[PDB]
Ligand binder design. Sequence first.
Ligand code: HEM
Ligand SMILES: CCCCCCCCCCCCCCCC(=O)O
Ligand SMILES: [Cl-]
Length: 420
Amino acid sequence: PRVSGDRTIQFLTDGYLLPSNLRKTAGLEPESMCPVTTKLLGQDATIVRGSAGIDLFYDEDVMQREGAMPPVIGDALVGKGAVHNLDGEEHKVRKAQMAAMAYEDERVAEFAPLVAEEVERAVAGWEGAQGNVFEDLSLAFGRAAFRWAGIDLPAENTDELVGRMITLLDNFGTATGTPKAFWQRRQLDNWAEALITDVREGRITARPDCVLEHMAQLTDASGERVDARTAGIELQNLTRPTVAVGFFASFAAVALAENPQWRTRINESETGREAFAFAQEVRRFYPFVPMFPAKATKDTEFEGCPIHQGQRVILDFVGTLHSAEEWDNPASFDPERFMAYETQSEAETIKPFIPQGGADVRTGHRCPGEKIAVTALSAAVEALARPEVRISAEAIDINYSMTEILARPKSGVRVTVASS
Ligand code: HEM
Ligand SMILES: CCCCCCCCCCCCCCCC(=O)O
Ligand SMILES: [Cl-]
């Protein structure tokens, strides 16, 4: 199944609709698990979804990541030289040092009280006032992330830097926004490089064993220290993605307005299980990652389709999270599908549940921040569900576009907290 012509522009105009549009244009039936091949940026690109597509995408014998992401996205979103671009042993060594910070249960347990504290502070600012879920909880997450990482700055400096990360996250994916994203990337990179260099030269003392200290000590596979700008880029890769949970927190507010019986179950629970399952179904249901790219390292073959060395393989995330072959009633928002699960570690066993990637965190490229993200999103869900929180139901607060990346309600979701 091919679609003719170069569809680079159609990737921009369709956003999250691109993979299902191309499958339709190729003549596949709805719910087909057949690959579809198009041309993107001058080369073939084969879009796959579902469990067999996950296995291909994460097979590092045949897939590499270097060069797979277009730099206009990647250089702005993750920075040059980031772990996302690395392959083989250099990737393994870099990923081990970053997963040691984000994915270890002891460090996640350090983050939990910080994000609960910052979320409660944001929600307190809504009392009798006009709040914004996306802007205010993204800022709360960023404040928690900076304190968690040991980035110790005056309050106004932290807020300004988190503000830059929000502006970057809110703009990297459109033609109008990309110069704004690249400007923020340069300022943030300059800031993080100077902070890393300050720690390495003794001008700033990091808390022992904190994330900032471990990023200043970042080394490569030969044993040499990674240059200071790249280490600052990796420090951002352990704080900016936490700010980005604000997108999921916006959707969670929409979902609580739309599911009042689940909201009641959360408010009446003492276990946290409903809020956890609700947070997971927000990540399953709502669009965040549209798709993700890799490049073939050698000629191979997937379900009768030839894969040429150098071409892209694109894992369709929306189509995997919404596949009728992988999920019962995938168009239904239904937290019951996660109610039997207790932790994010247990949720990893669900093979098509890949909102932040698939396969294994330490041996592959899968996101090492899912425990952090579910912790932050769960804290948001619990606070948003409380009955004094009044979530606006107007069309600009509740609806969101599927043709723009990243997606969120246009208003950010307006909220207020009832006060006497
Ligand atoms: C806001 C929710 C988040 C989403 C939707 C998200 C999504 C993703 C995705 C799709 C990937 C790529 C997986 C792959 O290459 O196969 C990724 C990688 C990564 N994420 Fe996340 N992420 C989130 C939160 C976080 C958090 C909280 C952290 C850490 C604090 C984090 C750090 C990373 C890192 C370091 C990588 C690169 C891993 C690698 O290439 O080996 N992310 N993320
Ligand atoms: C022409 C487009 C091809 C593929 C485009 C993929 C867009 C990727 C966007 C999501 C990347 C995951 C990182 C999210 C969290 C963060 O880095 O702050
Ligand atoms: Cl299911």
